[PDB]
Amino acid sequence: NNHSWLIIQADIYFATNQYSAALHYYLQAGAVCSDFFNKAVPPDVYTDQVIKRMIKCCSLLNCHTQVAILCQFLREIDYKTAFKSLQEQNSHDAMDSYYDYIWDVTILEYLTYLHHKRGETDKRQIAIKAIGQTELNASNPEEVLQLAAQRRKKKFLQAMAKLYF
Amino acid sequence: LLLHPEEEVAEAAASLLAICPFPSEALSPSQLLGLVRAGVHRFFASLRLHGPPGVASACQLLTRLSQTSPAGLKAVLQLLVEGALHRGNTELFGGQVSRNQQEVIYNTQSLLSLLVHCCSAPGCGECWGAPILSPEAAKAVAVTLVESVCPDAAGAELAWPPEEHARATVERDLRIGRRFREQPLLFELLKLVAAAPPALCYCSVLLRGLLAALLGHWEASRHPDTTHSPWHLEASCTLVAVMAEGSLLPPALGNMHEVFSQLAPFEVRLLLLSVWGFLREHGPLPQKFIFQSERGRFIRDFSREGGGEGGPHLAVLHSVLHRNIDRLGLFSGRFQAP
Amino acid sequence: TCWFEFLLEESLLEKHLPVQLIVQFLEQASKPNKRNRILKLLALKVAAHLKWDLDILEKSLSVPVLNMLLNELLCISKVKHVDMDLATLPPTTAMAVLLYNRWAIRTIVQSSFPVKQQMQQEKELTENILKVLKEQAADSILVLEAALKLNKDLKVKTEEMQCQVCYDLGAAYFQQGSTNSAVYENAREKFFRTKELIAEIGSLSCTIDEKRLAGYCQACDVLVPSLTPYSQVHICLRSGNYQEVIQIFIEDNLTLSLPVQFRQSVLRELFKKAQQGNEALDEICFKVCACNTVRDILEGRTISVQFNQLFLRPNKEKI
Numbered sequence: 001n002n003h004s005w006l007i008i009q010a011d012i013y014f015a016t017n018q019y020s021a022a023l024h025y026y027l028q029a030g031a032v033c034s035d036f037f038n039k040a041v042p043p044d045v046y047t048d049q050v051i052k053r054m055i056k057c058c059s060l061l062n063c064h065t066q067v068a069i070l071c072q073f074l075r076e077i078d079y080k081t082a083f084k085s086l087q088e089q090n091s092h093d094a095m096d097s098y099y100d101y102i103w104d105v106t107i108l109e110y111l112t113y114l115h116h117k118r119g120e121t122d123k124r125q126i127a128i129k130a131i132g133q134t135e136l137n138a139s140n141p142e143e144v145l146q147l148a149a150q151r152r153k154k155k156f157l158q159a160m161a162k163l164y165f
Numbered sequence: 166l167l168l169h170p171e172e173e174v175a176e177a178a179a180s181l182l183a184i185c186p187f188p189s190e191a192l193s194p195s196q197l198l199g200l201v202r203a204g205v206h207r208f209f210a211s212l213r214l215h216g217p218p219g220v221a222s223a224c225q226l227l228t229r230l231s232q233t234s235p236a237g238l239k240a241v242l243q244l245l246v247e248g249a250l251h252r253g254n255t256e257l258f259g260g261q262v263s264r265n266q267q268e269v270i271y272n273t274q275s276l277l278s279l280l281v282h283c284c285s286a287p288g289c290g291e292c293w294g295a296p297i298l299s300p301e302a303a304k305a306v307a308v309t310l311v312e313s314v315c316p317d318a319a320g321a322e323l324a325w326p327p328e329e330h331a332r333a334t335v336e337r338d339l340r341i342g343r344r345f346r347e348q349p350l351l352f353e354l355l356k357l358v359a360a361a362p363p364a365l366c367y368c369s370v371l372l373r374g375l376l377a378a379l380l381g382h383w384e385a386s387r388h389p390d391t392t393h394s395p396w397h398l399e400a401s402c403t404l405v406a407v408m409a410e411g412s413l414l415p416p417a418l419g420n421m422h423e424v425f426s427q428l429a430p431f432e433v434r435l436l437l438l439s440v441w442g443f444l445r446e447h448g449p450l451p452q453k454f455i456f457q458s459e460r461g462r463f464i465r466d467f468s469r470e471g472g473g474e475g476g477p478h479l480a481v482l483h484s485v486l487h488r489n490i491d492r493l494g495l496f497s498g499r500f501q502a503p
Numbered sequence: 504t505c506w507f508e509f510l511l512e513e514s515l516l517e518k519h520l521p522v523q524l525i526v527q528f529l530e531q532a533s534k535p536n537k538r539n540r541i542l543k544l545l546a547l548k549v550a551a552h553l554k555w556d557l558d559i560l561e562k563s564l565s566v567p568v569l570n571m572l573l574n575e576l577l578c579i580s581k582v583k584h585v586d587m588d589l590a591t592l593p594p595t596t597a598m599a600v601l602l603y604n605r606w607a608i609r610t611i612v613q614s615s616f617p618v619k620q621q622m623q624q625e626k627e628l629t630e631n632i633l634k635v636l637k638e639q640a641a642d643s644i645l646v647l648e649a650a651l652k653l654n655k656d657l658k659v660k661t662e663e664m665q666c667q668v669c670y671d672l673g674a675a676y677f678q679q680g681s682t683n684s685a686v687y688e689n690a691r692e693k694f695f696r697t698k699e700l701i702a703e704i705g706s707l708s709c710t711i712d713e714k715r716l717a718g719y720c721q722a723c724d725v726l727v728p729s730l731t732p733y734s735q736v737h738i739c740l741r742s743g744n745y746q747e748v749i750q751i752f753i754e755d756n757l758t759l760s761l762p763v764q765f766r767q768s769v770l771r772e773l774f775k776k777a778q779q780g781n782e783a784l785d786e787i788c789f790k791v792c793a794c795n796t797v798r799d800i801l802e803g804r805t806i807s808v809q810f811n812q813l814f815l816r817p818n819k820e821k822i
Contacts, residue, residue: 494718
């Protein structure tokens with residue numbers, strides 16, 4: 001139950017194209033740092049480099065909805081990678097049901113746009129309902145939005161760590 | 166193996182695990198979390214098939230898991246509360262979608278006893294004394310409750326809004342009320358949350374929608390008395406009772422649940438609106454509770470707050486009493502200033 | 504059967520043998536002198552024909568109409584109330600003065616009573632009237648007290664008048680008592696007083712709510728005691744004799760007489776008193792809790808979190 005060593009071993013499994021193990025031990029370090037993602041993971045452990053290695057591993061495992069939702073964990077939201085991976089149609093991560101973890105209005109708007117382009121009416125309606133949420137509105141006084149971000153971060157991290165362990 | 170289908174191997178593994186020591190260094194987060202999920206699954210399944218007698222193994226394990234570390238404590242509390250409130254493991258506790266009540270009380274006994282065991286601080290403290298529930302465990306139960314009932318947490322500020330907000334949040338408040346009527350264990354957990362002093366503040370959203378579903382009901386209750394809505398009367402008394410136990414209300418103002426069975430709906434609605442007004446002028450924030458290290462408990466002292474003894478809000482209550490001296494005259498010994 | 508018809512004849516009121524007539528006459532008289540005087544006289548006549556029953560007029564007629572009618576009667580009668588003393592006053596003038604003070608105290612009592620939720624002007628006038636009587640409630644209380652004390656002597660029984668005035672004065676004391684407990688003490692005495700009068704005359708005549716007086720007596724018996732198990736537990740908690748308190752609950756489990764929430768609330772108060780100090784109180788909290796636990800078993804209700812918190816370290820004494 002050290003977090004730096006779970007990170008180190010996640011990186012070691014990462015370099016050797018063991019991306020499932022890299023995700024496993026990245027998530028292990030993250031859940032050690034918080035209390036099962038109940039708290040907020042300290043920024044000095046889930047750093048931008050770690051988030052990027054994780055996002056690459058999730059892409060190579062074809063978990064592209066997970067890629068979109070991970071892309072918003074950075075200090076600046078990396079819209080380009082999430083947009084490209086959301087354009088993928090071969091994903092293995094329960095694309096629609098995972099939408100509750102999207103808190104970015106731009107990313108949801110982009111997803112609704114693809115669903116309109118591809119004719120996925122049910123996923124379009126799901127994305128629209130996700131956008132049509134009062135707490136998700138971009139005009140909230142900077143506190144409902146931050147709390148929404150933290151709670152979606154927590155739910156995402158804990159369901160992810162369940163999938164990997 | 167605690168997921169293995171045949172029951173005898175499952176119990177044998179569980180009874181090994183309950184007594185088999187955890188590794189000396191620590192439990193890996195994968196190991197810790199897999200053990201915790203297996204333990205709660207055994208506990209829940211042990212109970213579904215055996216009931217209260219046959220869960221001790223799992224319970225021991227879970228308790229042993231819950232004292233491992235705050236990460237394991239929060240994980241087991243969150244997973245036990247979530248599994249208690251899932252569409253499965255809900256019919257054991259009176260959850261909606263006929264079952265015997267007796268078994269429900271005693272299943273709930275096992276679950277709540279486990280939670281108290283996990284929550285309570287280990288380690289003669291007098292011959293009659295009781296161990297102190299920890300604040301943080303009830304805080305975690307509180308946040309898991311609020312995320313299970315009203316996941317948005319759109320009112321995540323603890324200070325209460327003006328009573329005009331209630332008509333802005335009608336759907337959310339009705340959702341919380343519907344959930345509380347559907348799953349009675351919720352109140353038990355609230356009482357458990359209330360059994361620790363501060364954590365009920367972190368359920369404030371719940372309670373605010375809860376009071377407004379109650380207030381809303383008392384809005385539209387056209388019946389001349391209070392007993393034509395049994396569940397709502399019991400929920401309101403339990404809420405004031407839980408708020409008064411959680412020390413969100415003063416003793417004089419919190420005792421009003423005693424008269425609620427002899428009141429008209431508008432009278433109790435004005436009483437609950439005085440509840441709302443008090444919660445507005447004071448608010449459930451953890452900083453007012455002070456840690457008495459002599460007994461080691463968080464205490465809420467209204468006297469130092471200033472006007473905490475219901476300066477004007479007791480005016481409404483006393484006006485109720487005077488209006489109802491014909492029936493509530495004897496009850497007047499419940500709401501005195503001292 | 505209208506306002507105009509009644510003002511025409513001087514004897515059609517006898518053929519009518521009323522509160523609607525009162526309010527119509529008052530509204531016509533107050534609409535923006537001989538006709539006004541005649542209407543006021545007719546209103547006084549019908550109000551007297553109602554035998555001066557304050558309850559019916561209070562429930563039918565609103566604050567401003569009845570206030571205007573009584574101000575008018577005080578105008579013809581005497582035309583300051585505190586200094587009159589009603590000693591040298593004629594009996595009709597004295598009864599008018601005491602009736603006005605009684606009505607004022609009754610309305611200031613009924614204003615505090617919570618209720619269900621042109622009109623705006625009437626509300627503003629009622630608010631102004633209530634503020635006026637608030638600024639002069641002490642004078643009305645003193646006048647009622649003097650009238651009760653001065654039992655010198657149409658004409659009705661002095662006992663009925665004194666009983667009604669002391670009952671209203673006691674109600675006013677009870678309403679005042681919410682701010683200050685000591686005032687309650689006075690109320691008790693006066694209530695005891697009317698109790699004696701209630702047992703003295705036994706005459707319906709005047710008419711007071713027996714249930715309300717019984718309730719006031721009950722309330723003063725517990726708030727200011729100076730029987731039932733309920734008040735026994737109240738007295739013992741006031742005294743701190745908790746062992747008989749446990750005994751009373753234990754006897755209750757057989758009868759289930761006390762209300763459940765009373766015991767839940769008293770146990771909660773016991774726990775709250777315990778967590779500050781009085782380390783010996785914890786056993787008490789256990790014991791009552793145990794009975795409550797046991798009681799909660801007999802009615803088929805869940806073991807409280809408090810027993811599950813108490814048996815965490817079981818002991819032979821506990822068991």
